[PDB]
Every structure is written in structure tokens, then in C-alpha cells.
Design a protein around this ligand. Structure first.
Ligand SMILES: *C(=N)[C@H](C[C@@H]1CCNC1=O)NC(=O)[C@H](CC(C)C)NC(=O)[C@@H](NS(C)(=O)=O)C(C)(C)C
Ligand SMILES: *C(=N)[C@H](C[C@@H]1CCNC1=O)NC(=O)[C@H](CC(C)C)NC(=O)[C@@H](NS(C)(=O)=O)C(C)(C)C
Lengths: 297, 302
């Protein structure tokens, strides 16, 4: 029993995180096979089409790349893919795990391996927000830190960290160099669309509260609302649409509470929470997924 | 910018977690040197003076120990130390890190390496509560999972998991085999004292919020009280309102000096908000977060 936001174990990712420095710019890279992925702004703060000419003018021998073992790697080639710089090394990483490059959807949760100087210093979970940001914890030098999980012995890579927007919001690319949310790696003003609370994860958290209380809650409404009616309301109140899933179906069956009862709870509690807490909180938790809640049963 | 509850990287610990089986009891062990630490109730569900005779009654060849690699270890000796069973292996773990066995105090936070069948499946942070429990996430087979952090290239081990009390409360021993909170590894009703909100961690969280408002609105937070309260006076109030006592620390001193805000203004804020929070949130919440430590907040400034 008990519900936590789980982090994936890090040993397989630690074996792939290297330091990448160029003319005093210090960040991190992901070494898979004979390929290092890192943010292109390790070269400097350029914009638009200046990048392709900065690339051809760069010097491979000036990429300072060290491993956690202290071994210096030698860059033999370079190219850009989106906002990710791709550096080929002379020798392959023999500790490359099985992996996939996957784009994270809204509400998807994964683990950040927060790195400085090529060394993972700590981990934490995050959720891909509706506006292409994550709520993370990053300082200077963290770029190149990666977001991942592990599923059936495969490392899924979702994210590489590039920049911090106002109000402690963070964003970056997938491992194919496409920026989440359409942001750009320029220190300029960028519009951030409003964050919509992730209904499906809130539903997971409400079910976790019900399972916890099994030992029905007073905050749980008794009336119902259809999925269409909730989704109409959601688009007007800052929530994502409710979408059916296998995990949510299992949670409803295990607890014996129809999910449309939880949707009505969301509408009423968002309008006026009142004095009754849900798992000690007077605000919705939306970074715990239905799959994780079910795995903890 | 941004504040998260951090987990320590797990590679050093993953290389030390093994599966330990005895007569259908399948748990986890911590393999350091030629020594495996695991919960004694891998031997079955006994009580009191029964354990020593059960230890003499067990035989080493019936312990099935396997590493994450699939390698079978051979137990050459056994002893009890408190509620921890200590098994000697024929060969030593060549991947043993530098480590310390340390007893976590109330409010100390660390990483749980949650393991099943000798394999770490996930991590998460926990805080040692005032009653000797942690609020974790554990299923059958999770015992022998360890709580740890890494400091200065040294793995501190604080905790090994033994049991789950009512209301999703988890507890266990330090690596010296002493149970936190005076619990025992028996399936009977047990006395569980109140869980008090950890003041020192709330203070840290409030500093984190001051820092965030400073770096988002260049001003002091709207909810921060103007008056101060004495530490002795706050600690008198804390004893009658379900909070731990405040106690100064180097990390809290640094946070006070970086932000320029007297910590006694934060203690008065706790008293005011606990009696009547109101409508202004703190870092998006209307309830105290007490599992983010001063040390962690300091490390997340730089
Ligand atoms: C990568 N090492 C670094 C990580 C930032 C630094 C503080 N917290 C983080 O997450 N990324 C940067 O410094 C980028 C680099 C540019 C070229 C994209 N710059 C920023 O993140 C910038 N924010 S912005 C895009 O101007 O709004 C800062 C440095 C002012 C935060
Ligand atoms: C160890 N693998 C297991 C971990 C528990 C199981 C479910 N969640 C956990 O944290 N520990 C046990 O099964 C112990 C064993 C005894 C001999 C110490 N038993 C319990 O935790 C028991 N709770 S109790 C001590 O009666 O209050 C359960 C199994 C009923 C939860």
C-alpha cells in the first residue's frame, strides 16, 4: 500500500551521460553507440539560419568530451538535427542499452536524470504539460540532461533539456531535435499557452484517494456528469479532456466508483474546494498517472 | 530555477541489491563486501526469544541468494543483529561502494530503492517521520529494500524495509538492525504515535517559495508575515498543535542569509497559516509541504 511518484532506476542512463564542453560552454550529452546527442547551443547563442554556418565553421578537435570513467572521447564528425547537435565518436559506447526515441504526450510522466559536468547528480519525475513544458529543477550547466523511463527492459528517451522559461518552467526537445511546444533555443520572449490540468491524472489521484480511504470519501460527489458534458466544461475551465484508458477502467472496477462520479467531483471542487481535503491537499494533483496508480495496487 | 523532491542516482545501490530466498520467503538483501544484510523474517514469522533458536535451526545451504547477473552466492555463516539477518558469502562483492550506516532522524530525507526479487524496480524520496515510519509505496516481496543517499562519494544507508502498519505506514530498521520507532517485526497490533508536521522542512519549503517569488515578482511573498515569533514560543505552540520543534541548522542559516529573511518570520507564518490559511497559495498549495529539506533547497539554488 501507499502511493508515490516513482522514478526509474538510473544505472543504464548513467552509463550514457557524458560531459560536452566547447570554448568554455559546459553542458551534458547522451552517448549511444558512436553518437553523442547534446543541445546545439553548446556552440553559442545563435538563431535562425546562423546555426548551419556555425556548424561548418566549428572544430571537432575543440569538443571536450569526457566520460564518467575519466576517458576522453574524440569527435570525428558533426551535424545538426533540429536543435540537437549530433557528434560522432571514434569508438562506440559498449555500455549502450536497448533504447527507443519516443515523443512524450500531454500527461505522460517520466524521469529526469539531472546532470552537471557529465555526472547525474539526482533524479525526479515530471509530467509533460499541455503547453510543451515540464515543471523541473535545473541550474546553469544542466542542459543535455535527459528524460526517460524503462519499460520491459528498454530505455525510452523522451526529452533533452535546453532552456528555462519564466515562472520556473522548463522545456527542450525530443531526441530527434524537435522542441516540445514549438519553443526555440533563443534567449528571447516566447509565448507560453496556459497550462491545462491533466484530467486523466487527476482521475488517477482521486482513485488513489478512494483506495487509501478504504479502511466512500466525504468529498466524493453523488451526482454524475457525462464524458461529453465534462469535456465541454473542461475546455472552458483549464482542464484537458477526459479520455478512457485500460488503467482508468480497472481503477473504476476495483474501487466500485464510476469515473463520471470523479468528473463531477473535479467540477465541484474546482469551483469551490471547501474545507475537506483530498489526500491532505486543497489543490489537484495531476502528475500521478492511472498506470502508476494501478501498478501500486 | 524550480524545486523538486530529489532522488539519489541508483547505480551504486543497484550493484549491491541481491535476492534472498529461504523456504518460500522471497525478499531482498544488501550485499556489501562478503556480507549480506536482509530482514530476519525471511526465516518466517517468529517473535521474541524464538529467533535465536530458529537461527541455529536454519542451515546455510538452504539460503538461495542470487545477484542481478543471475549468479548464485553461497552463504558460509549467519548471525542475527537486532532484526537484521547477516549472511556471510564465500566471495566478496567487488562492486561494493564506499558507504556508511547512519540512523535517520526525524525530518531526514533519503531515497528508497524499491526492489523485488533482488532487482530495483523504482526509486522515490521519503522523509523519516516523528513516529519512526515513512510514507512509502511497497507491496509483498519488497522487504530488504533500502533507503540511502550519496554524499561526497559515500553511500549513506539509513533504512531497510520490514513491514507496513495500518494507514499505509511503512517502517523497518537501520542497517545496525535497530527498528525505527520501537516497532517489531511481528504481525500484531502495534502502538503508532502521532505523525507531526516537520517544521524544519516546512521552513525550507517556505524559503524555496520566497526564492521563487523573488525570481518571479522581485518582491517578498504576499503571505509572509511581518512579525516574528521566538523559537521557544513557537516550539511551545508546536507541541500543542502537531508540529515538530524548530531547530537551527547550517542549511537553514544559509537560506536565511541568502534570502535576507529572518527564520522567525517563517515560524510566525506557520502559526498564522495553520490556524487560517486563507486564499493565497504557497507554491500552488494550501497545505504545508514538509518532505523538502533545507539541504535540498540549498542545493537547488546552487
Ligand atoms: C542549459 N545548460 C541551460 C539550462 C537553464 C539555465 C537555468 N535553468 C535552466 O534550465 N540553458 C540555457 O541557459 C538557455 C540557453 C539558450 C541559448 C536557449 N538559456 C535559458 O534558459 C535562459 N532562459 S530564456 C530562453 O531566455 O527565457 C536563462 C538562462 C535566462 C534562464
Ligand atoms: C516484506 N516483504 C513485507 C512488506 C509489506 C507487505 C505489503 N506492504 C509492505 O510494506 N513485510 C511483511 O509482509 C510483514 C512481515 C512481518 C513478519 C514483519 N508483514 C506486514 O507488513 C503486515 N502488516 S502488520 C506487521 O501486521 O501490521 C501485512 C502483510 C498485513 C501488511
Amino acid at each position: 500500500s501507499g502511493f508515490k511518484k516513482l522514478v526509474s532506476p538510473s544505472s543504464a542512463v548513467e552509463k550514457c551521460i557524458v560531459s560536452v564542453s566547447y570554448r568554455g560552454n559546459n553542458l551534458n550529452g547522451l552517448w549511444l553507440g558512436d553518437t553523442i546527442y547534446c543541445p546545439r547551443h553548446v556552440l553559442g547563442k545563435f538563431s535562425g539560419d546562423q546555426w548551419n554556418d556555425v556548424l561548418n565553421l566549428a572544430n571537432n578537435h575543440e569538443f571536450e568530451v569526457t566520460t564518467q570513467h575519466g576517458v576522453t572521447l574524440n569527435v570525428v564528425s558533426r551535424r545538426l538535427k533540429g536543435a540537437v547537435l549530433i557528434l560522432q565518436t571514434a569508438v562506440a559506447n559498449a555500455e549502450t542499452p536497448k533504447y527507443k526515441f519516443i515523443k512524450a504526450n500531454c500527461g505522460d510522466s517520466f524521469t529526469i536524470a539531472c546532470a552537471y559536468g557529465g555526472t547525474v547528480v539526482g533524479l525526479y519525475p515530471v509530467t509533460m504539460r499541455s503547453n510543451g513544458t515540464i515543471r523541473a529543477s535545473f541550474l546553469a550547466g544542466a542542459c543535455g540532461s535527459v528524460g526517460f523511463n524503462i519499460e520491459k527492459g528498454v530505455v525510452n528517451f523522451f526529452y533533452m533539456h535546453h532552456l528555462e522559461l519564466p515562472n520556473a518552467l522548463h522545456t527542450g526537445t525530443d531526441l530527434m531535435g524537435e522542441f516540445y511546444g514549438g519553443y526555440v533555443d533563443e534567449e528571447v520572449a516566447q509565448r507560453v499557452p496556459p497550462d491545462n490540468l491533466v484530467t486523466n491524472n487527476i482521475v488517477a489521484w482521486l482513485y488513489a484517494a478512494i483506495i487509501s480511504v478504504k479502511e466512500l470519501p466525504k468529498w466524493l460527489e453523488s451526482t454524475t456528469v457525462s464524458v461529453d458534458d465534462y469535456n465541454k466544461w473542461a475546455g472552458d475551465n483549464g482542464f484537458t479532456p477526459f479520455s478512457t484508458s485500460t488503467a482508468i477502467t480497472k481503477l473504476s472496477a476495483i474501487t466500485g466508483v464510476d469515473v463520471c462520479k470523479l468528473l463531477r467531483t473535479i467540477m465541484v471542487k474546482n469551483s469551490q474546494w471547501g474545507g475537506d481535503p483530498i489526500l491532505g491537499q486543497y489543490n489537484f494533483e495531476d502528475e500521478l498517472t492511472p498506470e502508476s496508480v494501478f501498478n501500486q495496487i
